[PDB]
Structure formats: structure tokens, C-alpha cells
């Protein structure tokens, strides 16, 4: 029950804030299927920040949950595919942790709309 333009402005800002937490840029683009030939074997829906940006601008995120769901996919896919003693796994835990406050604050603002 809100206006489209301010909401998308809020999602854009939120997405940039989330991306800022990924300092190694390991989640910026789709996992390279050419480099990881077995990836799709147990990852049913790959996700990444570039794809999220495309979805946002394609008006595919019209509520906060659908945005947050794809962010959570970035994290959960990474935890699933990689062993716990890897940099990738711990980077996903860190993103989940730091992304948490970013999402909570952004949703607060959305609920004012
Ligand atoms: C989030 C990126 C990712 N998640 N799991 C893996 C596993 C692998 C193997 C992987 C390899 C290269 C790479 O460049 C971004 C990302 C990779 N990766």
C-alpha cells in the first residue's frame, strides 16, 4: 500500500549497502559455471548481486521479502556449496551477519511508507 518510486530508491540504496559488506566482491557476479562445473548439481537457484540489480530494475522486487529472499540465497548457496574451513564459507557467514542490521534498518524505513 505504498508508492513504487520511493520504494525502489530504498531497495537501490539497500543493495549498495549490502554490496559494501562484500569487500572481496566474491558475490558481485554469478558463480562462474565454467570454473565450477559441478555447481548446479545441488544449487537449484544461483544468486548474486548483479542478478539482484537486474531483478530490481526489472520491477521484480515489489515488496521487501522478495528482495531479502534473494539476498538470503546468495548466502545460503555459498554455505551449502563450500566447506566450513574455506574463505568462501566464512565470507557468507560474515555477509549474513553484517547484512542483518542493514536489512532490519531498511525494512523499518519501508514500513513507514
Ligand atoms: C560466492 C562465490 C562462490 N561460492 N561458491 C563458490 C565456489 C567456487 C569454487 C568458486 C570459484 C570461483 C569463484 O569466483 C567468484 C567463486 C566461487 N564460489
From Swiss-Prot:
Acetylated by KAT6A. It comes from the Eukaryota. It is found in: Nucleus; Chromosome; Cytoplasm. Residues 2-106 form the Bromo domain. Transmembrane segments: none annotated. High levels in testis. Component of some HBO1 complex composed of KAT7/HBO1, MEAF6, ING5, and BRPF1. Component of the MOZ/MORF complex composed at least of ING5, KAT6A, KAT6B, MEAF6 and one of BRPF1, BRD1/BRPF2 and BRPF3. Interacts (via PHD-type zinc finger domains) with unmethylated histone H3 at 'Lys-4' (H3K4me0). Interacts with trimethylated 'Lys-36' of histone H3 (H3K36me3). Interacts with ING5; interaction directs BRPF1 to H4K4me3-enriched chromatin at the 5' of active genes. Interacts with KAT7. It is linked to Intellectual developmental disorder with dysmorphic facies and ptosis: An autosomal dominant neurodevelopmental disorder characterized by delayed psychomotor development, intellectual disability, delayed language, and facial dysmorphisms, most notably ptosis. Additional features may include poor growth, hypotonia, and seizures. Scaffold subunit of various histone acetyltransferase (HAT) complexes, such as the MOZ/MORF and HBO1 complexes, which have a histone H3 acetyltransferase activity. Plays a key role in HBO1 complex by directing KAT7/HBO1 specificity towards histone H3 'Lys-14' acetylation (H3K14ac). Some HAT complexes preferentially mediate histone H3 'Lys-23' (H3K23ac) acetylation. Positively regulates the transcription of RUNX1 and RUNX2. This is Peregrin. The lineage of its organism: Eukaryota, Metazoa, Chordata, Craniata, Vertebrata. The chain holds residues 627 to 739 of 1214 of the full protein.
